[PDB]
């Protein structure tokens, strides 16, 4: 499960950053998360994994109808290439999106902090596989990386939607539904972690340079991802990088799984078998 | 032209999106911290 957990975190996050549909990027972020708790499952940390489900439930669900708020308002368009400037145009959704993004990154004293950083802190402070640690650390940085992409393309940019703009969130059903999950996400982990009885042994004696790495790794994941994302502002010659050509097409996984074995078994049924 | 002009211009920088509400945040900090400081001083 360390083997499966580690690869799941990378590949889903690796394909996450190079996608364009809002729903796709958010979903890939989930599948990156489901990679996390099973990594924690392996090293005698089930309850933290189960606690990670609780905190992940709040903001991850939230990120969807906030994107759903953008999608329906801006004429059911899911391509990140067609929003921008929604910060001052969609205030509540922009606040809700960045709250979920910060929570999703385990940023301190929030829903994510009470689960993710304890997980990243615990995974290193144990006798595990080395290659799993490098992957979880990189995944967390990539976890923040596509989060910047969502805020950068969807909100912090010049508008790109069709001319007739119909964006609006003033419907009370939209406002109240998101607000409930908002006030939930701000505290959630603080209430739950302080309240549930101690069920594991929180390690204490532990050096600084992997204590801070729960937040260090995402600082760069914010930093260079922002630098590479805003590079699109500069008028530059377009060239498809091979790694991008790999990542953007879902790491080539569907084009082989969903074509090669499916063709063979179906063909085996016709040529052999039935005939 | 409209995509870059009108009210849709003057887009906030990337960081300012994260630091949204910091002004009122730090404003609520001093009142809350000052309240605790006197309450702890009374204690």
């Amino acid at each position: 499960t360390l083997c499966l957990g580690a690869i799941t975190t990378l590949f889903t996050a690796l394909c996450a950053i190079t996608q364009n549909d809002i729903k796709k990027i958010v979903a890939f972020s989930t599948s990156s998360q489901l990679g996390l708790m099973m990594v924690t499952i392996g090293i005698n940390q089930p309850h933290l994994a189960f606690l990670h489900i609780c905190m992940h439930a709040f903001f991850k669900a939230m990120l969807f109808m906030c994107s759903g708020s953008i999608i329906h308002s801006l004429n059911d368009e899911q391509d990140i290439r067609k929003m921008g400037g929604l910060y001052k145009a969609m205030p509540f959704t922009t606040t809700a999106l960045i709250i979920g993004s910060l929570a999703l990154t385990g940023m301190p004293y929030l829903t994510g902090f009470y689960s993710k950083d304890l997980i990243i802190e615990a995974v290193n402070m144990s006798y595990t596989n080395a290659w799993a640690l490098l992957m979880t650390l990189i995944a967390t940085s990539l976890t923040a990386a596509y989060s910047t992409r969502i805020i950068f393309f969807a909100f912090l940019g010049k508008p790109r939607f069709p001319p007739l703009v119909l964006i609006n969130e003033n419907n009370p059903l939209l406002i109240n539904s998101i607000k409930r999950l908002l006030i939930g996400s701000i505290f959630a982990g603080f209430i739950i972690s302080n309240n549930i009885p101690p069920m594991t042994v929180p390690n204490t004696t532990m050096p600084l340079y992997m204590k801070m790495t729960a937040l260090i790794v995402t600082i760069m994941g914010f930093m260079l991802a922002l630098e590479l994302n805003n590079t699109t502002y500069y008028l530059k010659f377009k060239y498809p990088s091979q790694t991008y050509k790999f990542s953007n097409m879902l790491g080539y996984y569907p084009s082989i799984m969903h074509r090669l074995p499916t063709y063979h078994n179906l063909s085996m049924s016709q040529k052999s078998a039935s005939s | 032209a409209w995509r870059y002009s009108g009210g849709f211009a003057n887009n906030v920088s990337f960081v300012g999106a994260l630091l949204k509400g910091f002004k009122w945040g730090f404003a609520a900090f001093v009142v809350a911290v000052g309240a605790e400081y006197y309450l702890e001083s009374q204690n």
């Binding site: 007739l164 119909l166 003033n170 | 849709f8």
Partner: peptide, 20 residues
């Protein structure tokens, strides 16, 4: 059918917001 919603669409200009 009948419109008259609290909002109104705009053409390439900033849509109206509300105090709330």
């Amino acid at each position: 059918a009948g419109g008259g919603v609290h909002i109104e669409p705009r053409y390439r200009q900033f849509p109206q917001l509300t105090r709330s």
